[PDB]
Amino acid sequence: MRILVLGVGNILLTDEAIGVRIVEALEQRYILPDYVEILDGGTAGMELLGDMANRDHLIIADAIVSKKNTPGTMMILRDEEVPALFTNKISPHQLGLADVLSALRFTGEFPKKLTLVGVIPESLEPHIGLTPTVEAMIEPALEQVLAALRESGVEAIPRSDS
């Protein structure tokens, strides 16, 4: 195993901060085994070309920004579905995340198991916070980053507090 848990989105666009808030809230609630970096990728998208590479299993957490589906809803997409989802031109950083998934496929340094714990926003406007609708989504997404870790048998320990 070698795992990244990568938070992404705009830390300025209300709910778009959710992908980052997931990984901040994971660090502050769960100790992980050594081989699980939590990493904030604040506003990057494209820069992560090198970081997302060569990892065995990568859990992204992000804002999906758009579908015809209700605010605050969760979607889980697995390896093949994730580049396809991020073809969405309405999702700005995510379009560069799509070209990271292009470039990882171009090198072949694409993971064994990409997973995306992705969240629909509510307001997505230039102020900071989540909406209440998406503040609530931190913990269902923690439970799905934790479920995704458990797909590889990686248990994680609440604060190492027991």
Side-chain angles (χ1 to χ4, degrees), residues 44-130:
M46 201 68 221
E47 311 299 270
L48 303 178
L49 200 170
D51 178 70
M52 290 175 41
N54 223 285
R55 312 314 191 142
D56 191 280
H57 165 185
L58 168 62
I59 307 168
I60 309 185
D62 202 347
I64 288 182
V65 187
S66 342
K67 204 91 84 167
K68 309 100 175 292
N69 193 16
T70 314
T73 307
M74 187 161 54
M75 305 189 197
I76 309 297
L77 287 320
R78 291 183 295 190
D79 197 274
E80 65 202 297
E81 305 176 288
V82 187
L85 181 283
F86 291 143
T87 63
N88 180 26
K89 307 303 180 72
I90 309 169
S91 309
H93 316 100
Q94 296 75 18
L95 217 180
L97 211 315
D99 194 47
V100 166
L101 297 168
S102 303
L104 287 195
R105 181 175 173 173
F106 298 172
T107 54
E109 296 201 18
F110 194 47
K112 307 294 183 172
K113 179 191 176 294
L114 201 147
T115 329
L116 193 228
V117 184
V119 187
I120 303 187
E122 173 84 283
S123 299
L124 202 107
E125 281 191 277
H127 67 313
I128 358 285
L130 301 317

Coordinates of all heavy atoms in Angstrom, one line a residue, residues 44-130:
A44 N -5.3 24.2 -6.6 CA -4.3 23.7 -7.6 C -5.0 23.2 -8.9 O -4.7 23.7 -9.9 CB -3.5 22.6 -7.0
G45 N -5.8 22.1 -8.8 CA -6.1 21.3 -9.9 C -4.9 20.8 -10.6 O -4.3 19.8 -10.3
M46 N -4.4 21.5 -11.7 CA -3.4 21.1 -12.6 C -2.1 20.8 -11.9 O -1.5 19.8 -12.4 CB -3.2 22.2 -13.7 CG -2.6 21.7 -14.9 SD -3.7 20.6 -15.8 CE -2.5 19.3 -16.3
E47 N -1.7 21.5 -10.9 CA -0.4 21.3 -10.3 C -0.2 19.9 -9.8 O 1.0 19.4 -9.7 CB -0.2 22.3 -9.1 CG -0.5 23.7 -9.3 CD 0.3 24.3 -10.4 OE1 1.4 24.8 -10.1 OE2 -0.1 24.2 -11.6
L48 N -1.2 19.2 -9.5 CA -1.2 17.8 -8.9 C -0.9 16.8 -9.9 O -0.9 15.6 -9.5 CB -2.6 17.6 -8.2 CG -3.1 18.6 -7.2 CD1 -4.5 18.2 -6.7 CD2 -2.1 18.7 -6.0
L49 N -0.5 17.1 -11.1 CA 0.0 16.2 -12.1 C 1.0 15.2 -11.6 O 1.0 14.0 -11.8 CB 0.5 17.0 -13.3 CG 0.7 16.3 -14.7 CD1 1.0 17.3 -15.7 CD2 1.8 15.2 -14.7
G50 N 2.0 15.8 -10.8 CA 3.1 15.0 -10.3 C 2.7 14.3 -8.9 O 3.2 13.2 -8.7
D51 N 1.8 14.9 -8.2 CA 1.4 14.4 -6.8 C 0.5 13.1 -6.9 O 0.8 12.1 -6.3 CB 0.7 15.4 -5.9 CG 0.4 14.7 -4.6 OD1 1.4 14.5 -3.8 OD2 -0.7 14.4 -4.4
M52 N -0.5 13.2 -7.8 CA -1.4 12.1 -7.9 C -0.8 10.9 -8.6 O -1.4 9.8 -8.6 CB -2.6 12.6 -8.7 CG -3.5 13.6 -7.9 SD -4.9 14.4 -8.9 CE -5.5 13.0 -9.8
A53 N 0.4 11.0 -9.2 CA 1.1 10.0 -9.9 C 1.7 9.0 -8.9 O 2.0 9.3 -7.8 CB 2.3 10.6 -10.7
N54 N 1.9 7.7 -9.4 CA 2.6 6.6 -8.8 C 2.0 6.2 -7.5 O 2.5 5.2 -6.9 CB 4.1 7.0 -8.7 CG 5.0 5.8 -9.1 OD1 5.2 4.9 -8.4 ND2 5.6 5.9 -10.3
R55 N 1.0 6.8 -6.9 CA 0.3 6.4 -5.7 C -0.4 5.1 -6.0 O -0.8 4.9 -7.1 CB -0.7 7.5 -5.2 CG -0.1 9.0 -5.1 CD 1.3 9.0 -4.5 NE 1.7 10.4 -4.2 CZ 2.4 10.9 -3.2 NH1 3.0 10.0 -2.3 NH2 2.5 12.2 -2.9
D56 N -0.6 4.2 -5.0 CA -1.2 2.9 -5.3 C -2.7 3.1 -5.3 O -3.4 2.6 -6.2 CB -0.8 1.9 -4.2 CG -1.1 0.5 -4.5 OD1 -2.3 0.1 -4.3 OD2 -0.2 -0.3 -4.9
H57 N -3.2 3.8 -4.4 CA -4.6 4.1 -4.2 C -4.7 5.6 -3.8 O -3.9 6.0 -3.0 CB -5.1 3.1 -3.1 CG -6.4 3.3 -2.4 ND1 -6.8 2.5 -1.3 CD2 -7.4 4.2 -2.5 CE1 -8.0 2.9 -0.8 NE2 -8.4 4.0 -1.6
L58 N -5.6 6.3 -4.5 CA -5.7 7.7 -4.3 C -7.2 7.9 -4.1 O -8.0 7.6 -4.9 CB -5.2 8.4 -5.5 CG -5.6 9.9 -5.6 CD1 -5.1 10.8 -4.5 CD2 -5.1 10.5 -7.0
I59 N -7.6 8.6 -2.9 CA -8.9 9.0 -2.6 C -8.9 10.5 -2.8 O -8.2 11.3 -2.1 CB -9.3 8.6 -1.2 CG1 -9.2 7.1 -0.9 CG2 -10.8 9.0 -1.0 CD1 -9.3 6.8 0.6
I60 N -9.5 11.0 -3.9 CA -9.8 12.5 -4.1 C -11.0 12.8 -3.3 O -12.0 12.0 -3.2 CB -9.9 12.8 -5.6 CG1 -8.8 12.2 -6.4 CG2 -10.1 14.3 -5.8 CD1 -8.8 12.6 -7.9
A61 N -11.1 14.0 -2.7 CA -12.4 14.6 -2.2 C -12.5 16.0 -2.8 O -11.5 16.8 -2.8 CB -12.3 14.6 -0.7
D62 N -13.6 16.3 -3.4 CA -13.8 17.5 -4.3 C -15.2 18.0 -4.3 O -16.1 17.3 -3.9 CB -13.4 17.0 -5.8 CG -13.0 18.2 -6.7 OD1 -13.2 19.4 -6.4 OD2 -12.4 17.8 -7.8
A63 N -15.5 19.2 -4.9 CA -16.8 19.6 -5.3 C -17.0 19.2 -6.8 O -16.2 19.5 -7.7 CB -16.8 21.1 -5.2
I64 N -18.2 18.6 -7.0 CA -18.6 18.2 -8.4 C -19.1 19.4 -9.2 O -19.0 19.4 -10.4 CB -19.6 17.0 -8.3 CG1 -18.8 15.7 -7.8 CG2 -20.4 16.8 -9.6 CD1 -19.7 14.5 -7.7
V65 N -19.6 20.4 -8.4 CA -20.1 21.7 -8.9 C -21.4 21.5 -9.7 O -22.3 22.4 -9.6 CB -19.0 22.5 -9.6 CG1 -19.5 23.9 -10.0 CG2 -17.8 22.7 -8.7
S66 N -21.6 20.5 -10.5 CA -22.8 20.4 -11.4 C -23.3 18.9 -11.7 O -22.5 18.1 -12.2 CB -22.6 21.2 -12.7 OG -21.5 22.1 -12.6
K67 N -24.6 18.7 -11.6 CA -25.3 17.8 -12.4 C -26.8 18.2 -12.3 O -27.1 19.2 -11.7 CB -25.1 16.3 -11.9 CG -25.4 15.3 -13.1 CD -24.2 14.9 -13.9 CE -23.4 13.8 -13.2 NZ -22.3 13.1 -14.1
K68 N -27.8 17.5 -12.9 CA -29.2 17.7 -12.6 C -29.5 16.8 -11.4 O -30.1 15.8 -11.5 CB -30.1 17.3 -13.8 CG -29.7 18.0 -15.2 CD -28.9 17.0 -16.1 CE -28.7 17.5 -17.5 NZ -29.9 17.7 -18.3
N69 N -29.0 17.2 -10.2 CA -29.2 16.5 -8.9 C -29.1 17.4 -7.8 O -28.5 18.5 -7.9 CB -28.3 15.2 -8.8 CG -28.8 14.3 -7.7 OD1 -29.9 14.3 -7.2 ND2 -27.9 13.4 -7.2
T70 N -29.8 17.1 -6.7 CA -30.1 18.0 -5.5 C -28.8 18.5 -4.9 O -27.9 17.7 -4.7 CB -31.0 17.2 -4.6 OG1 -32.0 16.5 -5.3 CG2 -31.7 18.0 -3.5
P71 N -28.8 19.8 -4.4 CA -27.7 20.3 -3.6 C -27.3 19.4 -2.4 O -28.2 18.6 -1.9 CB -28.2 21.7 -3.1 CG -29.1 22.1 -4.2 CD -29.7 20.8 -4.7
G72 N -26.1 19.5 -2.0 CA -25.5 18.7 -0.9 C -25.4 17.2 -1.1 O -24.9 16.5 -0.3
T73 N -26.0 16.6 -2.2 CA -26.0 15.2 -2.4 C -24.5 14.7 -2.6 O -23.7 15.5 -3.1 CB -26.9 14.8 -3.5 OG1 -28.2 15.4 -3.3 CG2 -27.1 13.3 -3.7
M74 N -24.2 13.5 -2.2 CA -22.9 12.9 -2.4 C -23.0 12.0 -3.7 O -24.0 11.5 -4.0 CB -22.6 12.0 -1.2 CG -21.2 11.4 -1.2 SD -20.5 10.9 0.4 CE -21.8 9.7 1.0
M75 N -21.9 11.9 -4.4 CA -21.7 10.9 -5.4 C -20.4 10.3 -5.1 O -19.4 11.0 -4.7 CB -21.7 11.5 -6.9 CG -22.9 12.3 -7.3 SD -22.8 12.7 -9.1 CE -24.0 14.1 -9.1
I76 N -20.3 9.0 -5.4 CA -19.0 8.2 -5.4 C -18.8 7.8 -6.8 O -19.8 7.2 -7.4 CB -19.1 7.1 -4.4 CG1 -19.6 7.5 -3.0 CG2 -17.7 6.4 -4.2 CD1 -18.7 8.5 -2.2
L77 N -17.6 8.0 -7.3 CA -17.2 7.6 -8.7 C -16.0 6.8 -8.4 O -15.2 7.1 -7.6 CB -17.0 8.8 -9.6 CG -18.2 9.6 -10.1 CD1 -19.4 8.8 -10.5 CD2 -18.6 10.7 -9.1
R78 N -15.8 5.7 -9.2 CA -14.6 4.8 -9.2 C -13.9 5.0 -10.5 O -14.4 5.5 -11.4 CB -15.0 3.4 -8.8 CG -15.5 3.3 -7.4 CD -15.9 1.9 -7.0 NE -17.0 1.4 -7.8 CZ -17.7 0.2 -7.5 NH1 -17.4 -0.5 -6.4 NH2 -18.6 -0.2 -8.3
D79 N -12.6 4.5 -10.5 CA -11.5 4.8 -11.4 C -12.0 5.4 -12.8 O -11.8 6.5 -13.0 CB -10.7 3.6 -11.5 CG -9.3 4.0 -12.1 OD1 -9.2 4.0 -13.3 OD2 -8.4 4.3 -11.2
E80 N -12.6 4.5 -13.6 CA -13.0 4.8 -15.0 C -14.0 6.0 -15.1 O -14.0 6.8 -16.0 CB -13.6 3.5 -15.6 CG -14.9 3.0 -14.9 CD -15.1 1.5 -15.1 OE1 -15.3 1.1 -16.3 OE2 -15.1 0.8 -14.1
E81 N -14.9 6.2 -14.1 CA -15.9 7.2 -14.0 C -15.4 8.6 -13.7 O -16.0 9.6 -14.1 CB -17.0 6.8 -13.0 CG -17.6 5.4 -13.1 CD -18.5 5.1 -11.9 OE1 -18.0 4.9 -10.8 OE2 -19.8 5.1 -12.1
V82 N -14.3 8.7 -13.0 CA -13.8 9.9 -12.5 C -13.3 10.9 -13.6 O -13.8 12.0 -13.6 CB -12.7 9.7 -11.3 CG1 -12.4 11.1 -10.7 CG2 -13.3 8.8 -10.3
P83 N -12.4 10.5 -14.5 CA -12.1 11.4 -15.7 C -13.3 11.8 -16.5 O -13.4 12.9 -16.9 CB -11.1 10.6 -16.5 CG -10.6 9.4 -15.6 CD -11.7 9.2 -14.6
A84 N -14.2 10.8 -16.7 CA -15.4 11.1 -17.4 C -16.3 12.2 -16.7 O -16.8 13.1 -17.4 CB -16.2 9.8 -17.6
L85 N -16.5 12.1 -15.4 CA -17.2 13.1 -14.6 C -16.6 14.4 -14.8 O -17.3 15.4 -15.0 CB -17.2 12.6 -13.1 CG -18.0 13.5 -12.1 CD1 -17.2 14.8 -11.7 CD2 -19.4 13.9 -12.6
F86 N -15.2 14.5 -14.7 CA -14.5 15.8 -14.7 C -14.4 16.4 -16.1 O -13.8 17.5 -16.3 CB -13.2 15.6 -14.0 CG -13.2 15.4 -12.5 CD1 -12.2 14.5 -11.9 CD2 -14.0 16.2 -11.6 CE1 -12.1 14.5 -10.6 CE2 -13.8 16.1 -10.3 CZ -12.9 15.2 -9.7
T87 N -14.9 15.7 -17.2 CA -15.1 16.4 -18.5 C -16.0 17.6 -18.4 O -16.1 18.4 -19.3 CB -15.5 15.5 -19.6 OG1 -16.8 14.9 -19.4 CG2 -14.5 14.3 -19.8
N88 N -16.8 17.8 -17.3 CA -17.8 18.8 -17.1 C -17.1 20.2 -17.1 O -16.4 20.6 -16.2 CB -18.5 18.6 -15.8 CG -19.5 19.8 -15.5 OD1 -20.1 20.4 -16.5 ND2 -19.9 20.1 -14.3
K89 N -17.4 21.0 -18.2 CA -16.8 22.3 -18.4 C -17.3 23.3 -17.4 O -16.6 24.4 -17.4 CB -17.1 22.8 -19.9 CG -16.8 21.8 -21.0 CD -15.3 21.4 -21.0 CE -15.0 20.4 -22.1 NZ -15.0 21.0 -23.4
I90 N -18.3 23.1 -16.7 CA -18.8 24.0 -15.7 C -17.9 24.0 -14.4 O -17.9 25.0 -13.7 CB -20.3 23.7 -15.3 CG1 -21.2 23.5 -16.6 CG2 -21.0 24.7 -14.4 CD1 -22.6 22.9 -16.3
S91 N -17.1 23.0 -14.2 CA -16.4 22.8 -13.0 C -14.9 23.2 -13.3 O -14.2 22.5 -14.0 CB -16.5 21.3 -12.5 OG -17.9 20.9 -12.5
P92 N -14.4 24.4 -12.9 CA -13.2 25.0 -13.4 C -11.9 24.3 -13.1 O -11.2 23.9 -14.0 CB -13.3 26.4 -12.9 CG -14.1 26.4 -11.6 CD -15.0 25.2 -11.9
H93 N -11.6 24.1 -11.8 CA -10.4 23.4 -11.4 C -10.5 21.9 -11.8 O -9.5 21.3 -12.2 CB -10.3 23.4 -9.8 CG -10.5 24.8 -9.3 ND1 -11.7 25.2 -8.7 CD2 -9.8 25.9 -9.6 CE1 -11.7 26.6 -8.7 NE2 -10.6 27.1 -9.2
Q94 N -11.7 21.4 -11.8 CA -12.0 20.0 -12.1 C -11.7 19.7 -13.6 O -11.3 18.6 -13.9 CB -13.5 19.7 -11.8 CG -13.8 19.8 -10.3 CD -13.9 21.3 -9.7 OE1 -14.0 22.2 -10.5 NE2 -13.8 21.5 -8.4
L95 N -11.8 20.7 -14.5 CA -11.4 20.6 -15.9 C -9.8 20.4 -16.0 O -9.3 19.7 -16.9 CB -11.8 21.8 -16.7 CG -12.3 21.6 -18.1 CD1 -12.7 23.0 -18.7 CD2 -11.2 21.0 -19.0
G96 N -9.1 21.0 -15.1 CA -7.6 20.8 -15.0 C -7.3 19.5 -14.3 O -6.3 18.8 -14.6
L97 N -8.2 19.1 -13.3 CA -8.1 17.8 -12.7 C -8.3 16.7 -13.8 O -7.7 15.7 -13.8 CB -9.2 17.7 -11.6 CG -8.8 16.8 -10.4 CD1 -8.2 15.4 -10.8 CD2 -7.8 17.4 -9.4
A98 N -9.2 16.9 -14.8 CA -9.4 16.1 -15.9 C -8.1 15.9 -16.7 O -7.8 14.8 -17.0 CB -10.6 16.5 -16.8
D99 N -7.4 17.0 -17.0 CA -6.1 16.9 -17.7 C -5.0 16.4 -16.8 O -4.1 15.7 -17.4 CB -5.8 18.3 -18.3 CG -4.6 18.0 -19.3 OD1 -4.8 17.1 -20.1 OD2 -3.7 18.8 -19.3
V100 N -5.1 16.4 -15.5 CA -4.2 15.6 -14.7 C -4.5 14.2 -14.9 O -3.6 13.4 -15.0 CB -4.3 16.1 -13.2 CG1 -3.7 15.0 -12.2 CG2 -3.6 17.4 -13.0
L101 N -5.8 13.8 -14.9 CA -6.2 12.4 -15.2 C -5.8 12.0 -16.6 O -5.5 10.8 -16.8 CB -7.6 12.2 -14.8 CG -8.0 12.4 -13.4 CD1 -9.5 12.5 -13.2 CD2 -7.5 11.3 -12.4
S102 N -5.8 12.9 -17.6 CA -5.3 12.7 -18.9 C -3.8 12.4 -18.8 O -3.3 11.3 -19.1 CB -5.5 13.9 -19.8 OG -6.9 14.2 -19.9
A103 N -3.0 13.3 -18.2 CA -1.5 13.2 -18.1 C -1.1 12.0 -17.3 O 0.0 11.4 -17.6 CB -1.0 14.5 -17.4
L104 N -1.8 11.6 -16.2 CA -1.5 10.4 -15.5 C -1.7 9.2 -16.4 O -0.8 8.3 -16.4 CB -2.4 10.2 -14.2 CG -2.1 11.1 -13.0 CD1 -2.8 10.5 -11.8 CD2 -0.6 11.3 -12.8
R105 N -2.7 9.2 -17.2 CA -2.9 8.1 -18.2 C -1.8 8.2 -19.3 O -1.4 7.2 -19.7 CB -4.3 8.2 -18.8 CG -4.5 7.1 -19.8 CD -5.9 7.0 -20.3 NE -6.0 6.1 -21.4 CZ -7.1 5.6 -22.0 NH1 -8.3 6.0 -21.6 NH2 -7.1 4.8 -23.1
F106 N -1.4 9.4 -19.6 CA -0.3 9.6 -20.6 C 1.0 9.0 -20.2 O 1.7 8.4 -21.0 CB -0.1 11.1 -21.0 CG -1.3 11.9 -21.7 CD1 -1.1 13.3 -21.9 CD2 -2.5 11.3 -22.0 CE1 -2.1 14.0 -22.4 CE2 -3.5 12.0 -22.6 CZ -3.3 13.4 -22.8
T107 N 1.4 9.2 -18.9 CA 2.6 8.6 -18.3 C 2.4 7.1 -18.0 O 3.4 6.4 -18.1 CB 3.0 9.4 -17.1 OG1 2.0 9.4 -16.1 CG2 3.5 10.8 -17.4
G108 N 1.2 6.7 -17.8 CA 0.9 5.4 -17.2 C 1.1 5.4 -15.7 O 0.9 4.3 -15.1
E109 N 1.4 6.5 -15.0 CA 1.6 6.5 -13.5 C 0.3 6.7 -12.8 O 0.2 7.2 -11.7 CB 2.7 7.5 -13.2 CG 4.1 7.1 -13.7 CD 5.3 7.7 -13.0 OE1 5.1 8.1 -11.9 OE2 6.4 7.6 -13.6
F110 N -0.8 6.4 -13.5 CA -2.2 6.4 -12.9 C -2.3 5.3 -11.8 O -1.7 4.3 -12.0 CB -3.1 6.1 -14.2 CG -4.6 6.3 -14.0 CD1 -5.1 7.5 -13.4 CD2 -5.5 5.4 -14.5 CE1 -6.4 7.7 -13.2 CE2 -6.8 5.6 -14.4 CZ -7.3 6.7 -13.8
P111 N -3.0 5.6 -10.7 CA -3.1 4.6 -9.6 C -3.7 3.2 -10.0 O -4.2 3.0 -11.1 CB -4.0 5.3 -8.6 CG -3.7 6.8 -8.8 CD -3.5 6.8 -10.3
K112 N -3.6 2.3 -9.1 CA -4.3 1.0 -9.1 C -5.8 1.1 -8.9 O -6.5 0.2 -9.2 CB -3.7 0.0 -8.1 CG -2.2 -0.2 -8.1 CD -1.7 -0.9 -9.4 CE -0.2 -1.1 -9.3 NZ 0.3 -1.9 -10.4
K113 N -6.2 2.2 -8.1 CA -7.5 2.3 -7.6 C -7.7 3.8 -7.3 O -7.4 4.3 -6.2 CB -7.6 1.5 -6.3 CG -9.0 1.6 -5.6 CD -8.9 1.0 -4.2 CE -10.2 1.1 -3.4 NZ -10.6 2.5 -3.0
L114 N -8.1 4.6 -8.3 CA -8.6 5.9 -8.1 C -10.0 5.8 -7.6 O -10.8 5.0 -8.0 CB -8.4 6.9 -9.3 CG -8.4 8.3 -8.9 CD1 -7.4 9.1 -9.8 CD2 -9.7 9.0 -9.0
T115 N -10.4 6.7 -6.6 CA -11.7 6.8 -6.0 C -12.0 8.3 -5.8 O -11.0 9.1 -5.5 CB -11.7 6.0 -4.6 OG1 -10.9 4.9 -4.6 CG2 -13.1 5.6 -4.3
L116 N -13.2 8.8 -5.9 CA -13.6 10.2 -5.7 C -14.8 10.3 -4.8 O -15.9 9.8 -5.2 CB -13.8 10.8 -7.1 CG -13.9 12.3 -7.2 CD1 -15.2 12.7 -8.1 CD2 -13.9 13.2 -5.9
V117 N -14.6 10.8 -3.6 CA -15.7 11.1 -2.7 C -16.2 12.5 -3.0 O -15.6 13.5 -2.4 CB -15.3 10.9 -1.2 CG1 -16.4 11.1 -0.3 CG2 -14.7 9.4 -1.1
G118 N -17.1 12.7 -3.9 CA -17.4 14.1 -4.5 C -18.7 14.6 -4.0 O -19.6 13.8 -3.7
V119 N -18.8 15.9 -3.9 CA -20.0 16.5 -3.2 C -20.6 17.6 -4.1 O -19.9 18.4 -4.7 CB -19.5 17.1 -1.8 CG1 -20.6 17.6 -1.0 CG2 -18.7 16.1 -1.0
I120 N -21.9 17.7 -4.2 CA -22.6 18.7 -4.8 C -22.7 20.0 -3.9 O -22.9 19.8 -2.7 CB -24.1 18.3 -5.3 CG1 -23.9 17.0 -6.2 CG2 -24.9 19.4 -6.0 CD1 -25.3 16.5 -6.8
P121 N -22.4 21.2 -4.4 CA -22.5 22.4 -3.6 C -23.9 22.9 -3.3 O -24.9 22.1 -3.5 CB -21.7 23.4 -4.5 CG -22.1 23.0 -5.9 CD -22.1 21.5 -5.8
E122 N -24.1 24.1 -2.9 CA -25.4 24.8 -2.7 C -25.3 26.2 -3.3 O -26.0 26.5 -4.3 CB -25.7 24.8 -1.2 CG -26.9 25.6 -0.8 CD -28.2 24.8 -0.9 OE1 -28.7 24.7 -2.0 OE2 -28.7 24.3 0.2
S123 N -24.4 27.1 -2.8 CA -24.3 28.5 -3.3 C -23.2 28.7 -4.3 O -23.4 29.2 -5.4 CB -24.2 29.4 -2.1 OG -25.2 29.4 -1.2
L124 N -22.0 28.2 -3.9 CA -20.8 28.3 -4.7 C -20.4 29.8 -5.1 O -20.1 30.0 -6.3 CB -20.8 27.3 -5.9 CG -19.4 27.0 -6.5 CD1 -19.0 25.6 -6.1 CD2 -19.4 27.2 -8.0
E125 N -20.5 30.7 -4.2 CA -20.3 32.1 -4.5 C -19.0 32.6 -3.8 O -18.5 31.9 -2.9 CB -21.5 32.9 -3.9 CG -22.7 32.9 -4.9 CD -23.8 33.9 -4.5 OE1 -24.6 33.6 -3.6 OE2 -23.7 35.0 -5.1
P126 N -18.4 33.7 -4.2 CA -17.1 34.3 -3.7 C -17.2 34.8 -2.2 O -17.1 36.0 -2.0 CB -16.6 35.3 -4.7 CG -17.9 35.8 -5.3 CD -18.8 34.6 -5.3
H127 N -17.4 33.9 -1.3 CA -17.2 34.1 0.2 C -16.8 32.7 0.7 O -16.8 31.7 0.0 CB -18.4 34.7 0.9 CG -19.7 33.8 0.9 ND1 -20.2 33.1 -0.1 CD2 -20.5 33.7 2.0 CE1 -21.4 32.5 0.3 NE2 -21.6 32.9 1.6
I128 N -16.4 32.6 2.0 CA -15.8 31.4 2.6 C -16.7 30.9 3.7 O -17.3 31.7 4.5 CB -14.4 31.6 3.0 CG1 -13.7 32.9 2.8 CG2 -13.5 30.4 2.4 CD1 -13.3 33.3 1.4
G129 N -16.8 29.6 3.8 CA -17.6 28.8 4.6 C -18.0 27.6 3.8 O -17.7 27.5 2.6
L130 N -18.8 26.6 4.3 CA -19.7 25.8 3.5 C -21.0 26.5 3.8 O -21.2 27.2 4.8 CB -19.8 24.4 3.9 CG -18.5 23.5 3.9 CD1 -17.6 23.7 2.7 CD2 -17.6 23.7 5.2

